[PDB]
Enzyme design. Structure first.
Site, PDB file in Angstrom:
ATOM      1  N   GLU A  11       0.788  -1.230   0.000  1.00  0.00           N
ATOM      2  CA  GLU A  11       0.000   0.000   0.000  1.00  0.00           C
ATOM      3  C   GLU A  11       0.821   1.283   0.000  1.00  0.00           C
ATOM      4  O   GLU A  11       0.291   2.340  -0.354  1.00  0.00           O
ATOM      5  CB  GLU A  11      -0.949   0.009   1.197  1.00  0.00           C
ATOM      6  CG  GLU A  11      -2.027  -1.070   1.175  1.00  0.00           C
ATOM      7  CD  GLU A  11      -3.059  -0.911   0.065  1.00  0.00           C
ATOM      8  OE1 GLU A  11      -3.085   0.145  -0.618  1.00  0.00           O
ATOM      9  OE2 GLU A  11      -3.869  -1.844  -0.109  1.00  0.00           O
ATOM     10  N   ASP A  20      -6.043   6.421  -4.985  1.00  0.00           N
ATOM     11  CA  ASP A  20      -5.572   5.050  -5.075  1.00  0.00           C
ATOM     12  C   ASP A  20      -5.603   4.542  -6.521  1.00  0.00           C
ATOM     13  O   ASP A  20      -5.834   5.311  -7.456  1.00  0.00           O
ATOM     14  CB  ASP A  20      -6.360   4.155  -4.108  1.00  0.00           C
ATOM     15  CG  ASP A  20      -7.792   3.907  -4.550  1.00  0.00           C
ATOM     16  OD1 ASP A  20      -8.193   4.275  -5.673  1.00  0.00           O
ATOM     17  OD2 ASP A  20      -8.538   3.314  -3.739  1.00  0.00           O
ATOM     18  N   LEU A  32      -8.727   4.143   2.621  1.00  0.00           N
ATOM     19  CA  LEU A  32      -9.724   4.707   1.727  1.00  0.00           C
ATOM     20  C   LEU A  32     -10.574   5.726   2.465  1.00  0.00           C
ATOM     21  O   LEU A  32     -11.132   5.420   3.514  1.00  0.00           O
ATOM     22  CB  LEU A  32     -10.607   3.593   1.164  1.00  0.00           C
ATOM     23  CG  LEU A  32     -11.756   3.995   0.251  1.00  0.00           C
ATOM     24  CD1 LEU A  32     -11.201   4.616  -1.023  1.00  0.00           C
ATOM     25  CD2 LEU A  32     -12.624   2.784  -0.069  1.00  0.00           C
ATOM     26  N   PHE A 104      -8.370  -6.366   2.570  1.00  0.00           N
ATOM     27  CA  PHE A 104      -7.965  -4.984   2.801  1.00  0.00           C
ATOM     28  C   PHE A 104      -8.065  -4.195   1.485  1.00  0.00           C
ATOM     29  O   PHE A 104      -8.587  -3.080   1.449  1.00  0.00           O
ATOM     30  CB  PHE A 104      -6.535  -4.954   3.347  1.00  0.00           C
ATOM     31  CG  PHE A 104      -6.059  -3.594   3.789  1.00  0.00           C
ATOM     32  CD1 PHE A 104      -6.071  -3.248   5.133  1.00  0.00           C
ATOM     33  CD2 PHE A 104      -5.556  -2.679   2.868  1.00  0.00           C
ATOM     34  CE1 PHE A 104      -5.611  -2.009   5.553  1.00  0.00           C
ATOM     35  CE2 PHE A 104      -5.100  -1.437   3.281  1.00  0.00           C
ATOM     36  CZ  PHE A 104      -5.132  -1.100   4.622  1.00  0.00           C
ATOM     37  N   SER A 117     -12.283 -19.765  -5.882  1.00  0.00           N
ATOM     38  CA  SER A 117     -10.925 -19.687  -5.342  1.00  0.00           C
ATOM     39  C   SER A 117     -10.941 -20.097  -3.877  1.00  0.00           C
ATOM     40  O   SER A 117     -10.072 -20.851  -3.424  1.00  0.00           O
ATOM     41  CB  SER A 117     -10.369 -18.263  -5.417  1.00  0.00           C
ATOM     42  OG  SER A 117     -10.334 -17.752  -6.734  1.00  0.00           O
ATOM     43  N   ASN A 132      -6.767 -20.009 -10.277  1.00  0.00           N
ATOM     44  CA  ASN A 132      -8.095 -19.437 -10.282  1.00  0.00           C
ATOM     45  C   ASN A 132      -8.100 -17.985  -9.801  1.00  0.00           C
ATOM     46  O   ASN A 132      -8.819 -17.147 -10.346  1.00  0.00           O
ATOM     47  CB  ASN A 132      -9.014 -20.281  -9.415  1.00  0.00           C
ATOM     48  CG  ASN A 132     -10.456 -19.891  -9.579  1.00  0.00           C
ATOM     49  OD1 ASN A 132     -10.993 -19.158  -8.759  1.00  0.00           O
ATOM     50  ND2 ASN A 132     -11.089 -20.361 -10.652  1.00  0.00           N
TER      51      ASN A 132
END
Ligand SMILES: O/N=C\c1cccs1
Length: 163
Positions: A11, A20, A32, A104, A117, A132
């Site tokens: 990040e 972002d 965010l 996240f 998945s 996947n």
């Protein structure tokens, strides 16, 4: 390596409001603020989150405080999600970090499309799960990061981050 160091790599750390990868106002370590294109709305969210008039800028300590809150809330969210908790609890600690990282970034809503998945991860079919996971908007939009998170899911090691 641990979840904080992992997400810090993925990040970054920026002390002024920035957009972002999706063009959304953000600050700190991927905190965010809003999906609103209104910068003033983002500044209001920032001030609300920090508890003072920040005028679009925070300190490293403040960024790290939001980060702690955000990581904790991500895990707690997984644990109260009936679809995510059993898969999460089936995983070893390193793979759990990959799960937290993905949530996240994408949120629980984002992880909603990963049913197949998830099933493969719970089955510990690691190479299949990894294949996947990459068949995704997530991968295509943020491939370098997704590759690291996927390697973590595939191997249960920190090889993609120890560099
Ligand atoms: O894979 N991304 C998120 C999660 C997986 C399992 C529990 S949360």
């Amino acid at each position: 390596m641990n979840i904080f160091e992992m997400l810090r790599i993925d990040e970054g750390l920026r002390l002024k409001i920035y957009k972002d990868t999706e063009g959304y106002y953000t600050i700190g370590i991927g905190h965010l603020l809003t999906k609103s294109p209104d910068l003033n709305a983002a500044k209001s969210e920032l001030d609300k989150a920090i508890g003072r008039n920040c005028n679009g800028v925070i300190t490293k300590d403040e960024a790290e405080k939001l980060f702690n809150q955000d990581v904790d809330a991500a895990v707690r969210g997984i644990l109260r999600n009936a679809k995510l908790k059993p898969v999460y609890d089936s995983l070893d600690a390193v793979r759990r970090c990959a799960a937290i990282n993905q949530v996240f970034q994408m949120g629980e809503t984002g992880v909603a499309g990963f049913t197949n998945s998830l099933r493969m991860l719970q089955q510990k079919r690691w190479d299949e799960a990894a294949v996947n996971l990459a068949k995704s908007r997530w991968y295509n939009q943020t491939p370098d990061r997704a590759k690291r998170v996927i390697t973590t899911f595939r191997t249960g090691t920190w090889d993609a981050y120890k560099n």
